[PDB]
Amino acid sequence: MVALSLKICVRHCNVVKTMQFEPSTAVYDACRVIRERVPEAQTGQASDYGLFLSDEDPRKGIWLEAGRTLDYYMLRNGDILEYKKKQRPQKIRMLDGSVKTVMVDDSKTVGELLVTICSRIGITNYEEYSLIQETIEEKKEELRDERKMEKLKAKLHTDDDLNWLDHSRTFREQGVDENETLLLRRKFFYSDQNVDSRDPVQLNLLYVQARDDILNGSHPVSFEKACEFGGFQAQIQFGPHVEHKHKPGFLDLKEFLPKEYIKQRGAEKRIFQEHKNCGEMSEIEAKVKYVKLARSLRTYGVSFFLVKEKMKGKNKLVPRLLGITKDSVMRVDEKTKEVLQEWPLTTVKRWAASPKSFTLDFGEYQESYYSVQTTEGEQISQLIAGYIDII
Secondary structure, three states, X not given: OOOEEEEEEEOOOOEEEEEEEOOOOEHHHHHHHHHHHOHHXXXXXXXXXXXXXXXXXXXXXXXXXXXXXXXXXXXXXOOEEEEEEOEEEEEEEOOOOOEEEEEEEOOOOHHHHHHHHHHOOOOXXXXXXXXXXXXXXXXXXXXXXXXXXXXXXXXXXXXXXXXXXXXXXOOOOOOOOOOOEEEEEEOOOOOOHHHOOOOHHHHHHHHHHHHHHHHOOOOOOOHHHHHHHHHHHHHHHHOOOOOOOOOOOOOOHHHOOOHHHOOOOOHHHHHHXXXXXXXXXXXXXXXXXXXXXXXXXXXXXXXXEEXXXXXXXXXXXXXXXXXXXXXXXXXXXXXXXXXXXXXEHHHEEEEEEOOOEEEEEEOOOOOOOEEEEOOOHHHHHHHHHHHHOOO
């Protein structure tokens, strides 16, 4: 056996403890023993702490990965590690021009951090955003051949393109130090500006809408997804999940699930399960995840009609949901809310509506013409006409 004797720094090296570890000791078990040996090292929980090894440069430092082993960073007897809190302040200029000091996990890449930074502000399309190392240097202390050239070069000036950050790296790896102020800026332009939020006020309007169509049945979701929304909703109205308070029977299921799922077994348990999955996320962050979850579903922004159709060789209708949206028409299982088939609107050749049925003709000679028994055939005809007439 070889013993690895290390000094452990706790609370900014206010406490230095000499301890003995195996070289092959995993980093987490090392953190586990540090917690359970030094009483000064039991603040909060282990998720907010880790082992930090400083490099030759005081601005270069490495956080040990839990899955790795102490030996992996080539630690020899006498070396020092810090049991360091990873949440550290970082000043970032928001979308409203104000510089805000936010806590960031120093161990995470700026790509992962941007997910928590923007969504806590209300941005729903946080993927399209990034950060810039902003530089301010504008406060000055204090001919026919050569400068004719100097006026073309001065008028033909460089574009000093934006100094974005690398999402694959952390703040320490890219040279961004603690008390520097960064600027939040949108980098990509794929979604429209009028369909996303940037402040909590316009975000709440998105959430209030999305929750309404889910709860009144306008947006058909499956029972599993319904409790995932309920889990988010519970976080919004009650905060982080607490096992000993949010007990069975605590909820009013009507305010949380569609009507068809209130009676289904295990509803409150699955809601509470997703509630503690959120952890300690904020209400604003919870609203962002609720909205993005609704938009992620293929049934988002689709008007559905409860119709009846035939399947293979069984002379009996099946309850189906007929979806009509701005670009496509789809079949949806009424119980599981799965998308069984989908046609783009471009392919719809012609349609017909009876007082008892509704027929569709695609290019495919397919199987007959897709026909469904419905009392709202003319209603469906008006809707898809308003889509194809104006395209």
